[PDB]
Design a protein around this nucleic acid. Structure first.
Ligand SMILES: [Mg+2]
Ligand SMILES: [Mg+2]
Ligand SMILES: [Mg+2]
Ligand SMILES: [Mg+2]
Ligand SMILES: [Mg+2]
Ligand SMILES: [Mg+2]
Ligand SMILES: [Mg+2]
Ligand SMILES: [Mg+2]
Ligand SMILES: [Mg+2]
Ligand SMILES: [Mg+2]
Ligand SMILES: [Mg+2]
Ligand SMILES: [Mg+2]
Ligand SMILES: [Mg+2]
Ligand SMILES: [Mg+2]
Ligand SMILES: [Mg+2]
Ligand SMILES: [Mg+2]
Ligand SMILES: [Mg+2]
Ligand SMILES: [Mg+2]
Ligand SMILES: [Mg+2]
Ligand SMILES: [Mg+2]
Ligand SMILES: [Mg+2]
Ligand SMILES: [Mg+2]
Ligand SMILES: [Mg+2]
Ligand SMILES: [Mg+2]
Ligand SMILES: [Mg+2]
Ligand SMILES: [Mg+2]
Ligand SMILES: [Mg+2]
Ligand SMILES: [Mg+2]
Ligand SMILES: [Mg+2]
Ligand SMILES: [Mg+2]
Ligand SMILES: [Mg+2]
Ligand SMILES: [Zn+2]
Lengths: 38, 118, 175, 134
RNA sequence: GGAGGUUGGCUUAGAAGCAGCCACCCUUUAAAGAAAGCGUAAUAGCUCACUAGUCGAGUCGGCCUGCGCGGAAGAUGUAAC
RNA sequence: UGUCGGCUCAUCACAUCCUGGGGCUGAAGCCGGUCCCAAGGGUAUGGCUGUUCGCCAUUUAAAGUGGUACGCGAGCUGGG
């Protein structure tokens, strides 16, 4: 998990989701594209 | 995607223009053929005479207004491999026997030798 | 709402009872599928089952597609038993089904015994295959996910319990 | 299994990267067909012929008469192409050597119908300088 | 389905649409860039872009603006109505 | 309104040094790096120097960073 103030898509498989008041990025290709906050 | 101006309203007429020159037409479900296998088939329309092509199903059903193969309205569904045979009336369905001999494909929906619903 | 407007189209032998918002479905090889719908939901009975929203609220629109999915799961469940497939990868990894207890060998000092909750039953056609099989998806999927969490797959050898349809990421140590 | 075999000699593995590959075709097996691949099979040049397996490690060989650049080099005699396109030229001929080259080269390896291979044959040398007007 | 000229050339042992620099055609058609991504030592191999059928009514993105969300860690005790 | 350091006795924060729970890794294993959660309890002895610090020697799971009149002389000392 990467926690930044600026979270965004890094590839075509990344998704932006809002999960209990927090913006997150979940990717099904690279586990390095997981993000939190922002 | 073809727009209604550049195409999709002209290529519908061209096959209708070429519709009123043929005696036979074999429609086959040509789905799953390799590019070479089609090319091998496509290196036969220039030899024995055929107008083989693929077009939109809705356009094809609107391309029979010239009363050439009206009996195919009820079969204008699924994949299309229209094979108009203008020169040497027929002679393409025989190639279809040769075409489908080595393939599991080419179910061949119907043949339109003159007015005839297969 | 494409999901909501879709009717259920119940099969031949299924019994449906509607005592208000509460609903109960009976079927073969399992029955007693009890559910309650939120007050914003209308379940109208006909030759099939249809679902529609009372209010115009955005949350009421969301729950219309949830009820349709939930009811369709009960109908399929009491007609076809839902199932999940797990397989074990690794040397010495075995699964044995013994009634309502499941024993797994996953490389620990102690064998692990897993107790299956009532309802579902587990079957092991091979020593490296597990069949979880029940009538409601949530219980079938929760149990399969609990077994998988004993030792989930790892990227270097692929060892560990996995879903049959699961794609496991693989990597190698560099140089 | 796309591969290449040296005309008249199949023993050299590093020349073709033999053994390891898609299949397990024997290195010494192709030596027999190498005799058939001579004189009229690009002698002295590495003609690429793909391979196939019937049951296990077959010797299914192919034949490529003359590639476009192989034909273009044969028809022109130049040593190399242009590193910078539209900057350097080497010299070309009329669009008449292409007709006889394409007729020999296409045969069944091209789907061109009539004067269609002229564009395809000129396509390989289109970006290699030597502008042609007639 | 998603191709052949075509391991584009230069160099590189070799670097083959995917080591770096030049511009980036044409046949078949329903489609295809001298090729967008992960890839091989280099090949090979999974895709993608584009198109045919399928299901049958909406769907896609940008601009202006109101109110909110994250960014937001301190010391005696809630303790920034 | 007595100003450095030492002794004695502390109390709080968390921006966590150890122990506890996790994600990613250019994570094979044993070791690590980085970030997230967590303040319950722990968290050296000496040689030199008035020293706080610092450098050395040998330990330890670890030898945290700060606030409290740079905590504490109507509690001690008096080397600066
Ligand atoms: Mg939670
Ligand atoms: Mg704010
Ligand atoms: Mg606080
Ligand atoms: Mg505060
Ligand atoms: Mg305070
Ligand atoms: Mg507090
Ligand atoms: Mg107040
Ligand atoms: Mg008040
Ligand atoms: Mg406090
Ligand atoms: Mg913290
Ligand atoms: Mg710590
Ligand atoms: Mg860690
Ligand atoms: Mg930090
Ligand atoms: Mg603590
Ligand atoms: Mg503490
Ligand atoms: Mg405490
Ligand atoms: Mg506390
Ligand atoms: Mg406690
Ligand atoms: Mg000491
Ligand atoms: Mg001293
Ligand atoms: Mg130690
Ligand atoms: Mg303190
Ligand atoms: Mg003081
Ligand atoms: Mg202090
Ligand atoms: Mg004193
Ligand atoms: Mg003092
Ligand atoms: Mg005194
Ligand atoms: Mg005092
Ligand atoms: Mg006092
Ligand atoms: Mg006193
Ligand atoms: Mg003094
Ligand atoms: Zn991603």
């Amino acid at each position: 998990m990467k926690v930044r103030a600026s979270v965004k898509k890094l590839c075509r498989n990344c998704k932006i989701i809002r999960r209990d008041g927090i913006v997150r990025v979940i990717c099904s290709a690279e586990p390095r594209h997981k993000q939190r906050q922002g | 995607m073809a727009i209604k101006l550049e195409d999709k309203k002209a290529i519908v007429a061209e096959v209708n223009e070429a519709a009123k020159a043929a005696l036979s037409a074999v429609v086959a479900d040509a789905r799953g053929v390799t590019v070479g296998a089609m090319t091998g088939l496509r290196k036969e329309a220039r030899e024995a005479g055929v107008y083989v092509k693929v077009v939109r199903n809705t356009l094809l059903k609107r391309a029979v207004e010239g009363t050439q193969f009206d009996v195919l309205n009820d079969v204008f569904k699924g994949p299309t491999l229209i094979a108009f045979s203008n020169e040497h009336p027929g002679a393409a369905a025989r190639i279809f026997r040769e075409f489908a001999k080595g393939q599991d494909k080419f179910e061949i929906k119907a043949a339109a030798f003159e007015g005839q619903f297969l | 709402s494409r999901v909501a407007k879709n009717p259920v189209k119940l099969p031949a032998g299924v019994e449906i009872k509607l005592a208000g918002q509460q609903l109960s479905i009976k079927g073969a090889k399992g029955a007693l599928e009890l559910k309650v719908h939120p007050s914003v939901e209308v379940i109208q009975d006909s030759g099939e089952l249809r679902f529609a929203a009372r209010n115009g609220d955005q949350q009421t629109r969301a729950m219309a597609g949830t009820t349709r999915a939930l009811v369709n799961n009960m109908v399929v469940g009491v007609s076809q038993g839902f199932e999940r497939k797990l397989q074990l990868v690794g040397v010495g990894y075995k699964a044995q089904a013994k009634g309502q207890v499941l024993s797994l060998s996953l490389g620990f000092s102690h064998p692990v015994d897993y107790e299956l909750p009532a309802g579902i039953v587990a079957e092991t056609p091979s020593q490296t295959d597990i069949l979880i099989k029940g009538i409601d998806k949530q219980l079938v999927g929760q149990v399969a996910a609990e077994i998988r969490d004993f030792r989930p797959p790892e990227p270097y050898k692929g060892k560990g319990v996995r879903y049959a349809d699961e794609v496991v990421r693989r990597k190698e140590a560099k140089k | 299994i796309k591969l290449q075999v040296k005309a008249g000699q199949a023993n050299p593995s590093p020349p073709v990267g033999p053994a390891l590959g898609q299949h397990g075709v024997n290195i010494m097996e192709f030596c027999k067909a190498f005799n058939a691949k001579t004189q009229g099979q690009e002698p002295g040049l590495p003609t690429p012929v793909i391979i196939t397996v019937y049951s296990d490690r077959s010797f299914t060989f192919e034949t490529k008469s003359t590639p476009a650049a192989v034909l273009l080099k044969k028809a022109a005699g130049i040593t190399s192409g242009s590193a910078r396109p539209n900057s350097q030229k080497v010299g070309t001929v009329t669009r008449a050597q292409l007709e006889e080259i394409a007729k020999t080269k296409q045969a069944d390896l091209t789907a061109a119908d009539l004067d269609a291979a002229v564009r395809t044959i000129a396509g390989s040398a289109r970006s290699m300088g030597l502008n042609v007007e007639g």
